[PDB]
Design a protein around this ligand. Structure first.
Ligand SMILES: Nc1ncnc2c1ncn2[C@@H]1O[C@H](COP(=O)(O)OP(=O)(O)OP(=O)(O)O)[C@@H](O)[C@H]1O
Ligand SMILES: Nc1ncnc2c1ncn2[C@@H]1O[C@H](COP(=O)(O)OP(=O)(O)OP(=O)(O)O)[C@@H](O)[C@H]1O
Ligand SMILES: Cc1cn([C@H]2C[C@H](O)[C@@H](COP(=O)(O)O)O2)c(=O)[nH]c1=O
Ligand SMILES: Cc1cn([C@H]2C[C@H](O)[C@@H](COP(=O)(O)O)O2)c(=O)[nH]c1=O
Lengths: 208, 208
């Protein structure tokens, strides 16, 4: 089973992955986790991050260029994902294809039924062959709280200055809204919308 | 030995590669040829071409985004290039790293000593590890003649409509000028500037 944890930056995704992993292992399931972007491992991922921090000229100014880099990173992980699904009972991804749909649509002020979301569908799932997840869990949080976390993280870690998207409060707001639409639409597969207070044990039971 | 044939679109590069290959083989050297972009083989290359034909939203509007796609295509060919150099006496490339420097600088109205050219140097040769060619042959041609060839090709082949750059006559002009500067500068290695009338036998002798 392939599960993707989605949400805006600062939503608490990494923490949910950790808690969920423990819940699954408690239930006797083998668990593997993979996070996107695959920084260090993927040049596309690194260039994208660098672009979001002021490098590489006009690269970040293009919505589709950024989406393409994140898609190329995932395309290079297809073998990894297939291998993990063959080796473990549960594979949990911290961010996946839906991240591209949410942020891309938001940057263009489009909704989940828009052009960008459809483009991501055609490119990543169909053309690049990324498998559709069995579950996509939206960790919904208020834009204000998520933002406060992204800022706090930058104040405590010098190698963690916020990226261009995180410095755009309205973009974060719109991204959260597109995520809610994607979930209601069942974009790319079935979704579950949860909060930071969700019970790992029950969530794992629902997913397994 | 690694030789790259450079020049604007419609300059006559493919023809020179063919004639040069024959000249080298006549001299008893084994020859291999590789062309960039690696259409079909590289997703980055295909997406880039598609973007230059009106697809993928605002992707082509970013100079660095386009340069990145062409660089990622080449990065995926490093193994191929090293293998060819180990297996043949001469390896001839139809377009290489300099193509990115020339077109990128031109789109930004910069010269060979500019930011874009330097960025290409840092990314492709240093960061991505692409080997610097032993020779870079600039097939210089008048912008008018090159353009007439690109147009004529589109009139005869339906699957060959001109790309966005080819539809920009001034851009082609500026690209030719940046190429001349790159050659005079010895950018990325030594260059040779030749015309369509160059003698394959002598050119091959010079390169070998
Ligand atoms: N970014 C990553 N996050 C988590 N696990 C990863 C990541 N990249 C690779 N792995 C895991 O580490 C082990 C793999 O890597 P290696 O990188 O050694 O694989 P390969 O030798 O390229 O094998 P394969 O094609 O199966 O991935 C695999 O079992 C894979 O599931
Ligand atoms: N786009 C290309 N143009 C010309 N020759 C190519 C191209 N792609 C691969 N080749 C050549 O075709 C043969 C290779 O390909 P294959 O694609 O079968 O290689 P591999 O099995 O991936 O081997 P290697 O790592 O050596 O490339 C090689 O000898 C290589 O030099
Ligand atoms: C994985 C992914 C991240 N992003 C965004 C989220 C951030 O603003 C940034 C990097 O992600 P990260 O904060 O999870 O490391 O890029 C996308 O736009 N598309 C994607 O596919
Ligand atoms: C290989 C390469 C081509 N190009 C340009 C030349 C064209 O306008 C187009 C495709 O190249 P092509 O006409 O040789 O198939 O992109 C670059 O800008 N950078 C590159 O690295």
């Amino acid at each position: 089973m392939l599960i993707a944890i989605e949400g805006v930056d600062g939503a608490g995704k990494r923490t949910l992955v950790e808690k969920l992993s423990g819940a699954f292992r408690a239930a006797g399931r083998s668990v593997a986790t993979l996070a996107f972007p695959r920084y260090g491992q993927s040049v596309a991922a690194d260039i994208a991050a660098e672009a979001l921090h002021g490098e590489h000229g006009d690269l970040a100014s293009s919505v589709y260029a950024m989406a393409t880099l994140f898609a190329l990173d995932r395309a290079g992980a297809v073998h990894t994902i297939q291998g993990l699904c063959r080796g473990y009972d549960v594979v949990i991804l911290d961010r996946y294809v839906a991240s591209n749909a949410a942020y891309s649509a938001a940057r263009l002020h489009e909704n989940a039924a828009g052009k960008a979301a459809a483009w991501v569908q055609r490119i990543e799932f169909a053309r690049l062959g990324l498998p559709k997840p069995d579950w996509q869990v939206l960790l919904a949080v208020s834009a204000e709280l998520a933002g406060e976390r992204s800022r706090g993280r930058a104040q405590r870690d010098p190698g963690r200055a916020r990226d261009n998207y995180e410095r755009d409060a309205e973009l974060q707001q719109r991204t959260g809204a597109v995520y809610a639409e994607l979930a209601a639409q069942g974009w790319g597969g079935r979704w579950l919308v949860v909060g930071a207070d969700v019970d790992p044990g029950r969530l794992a039971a629902t997913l397994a």
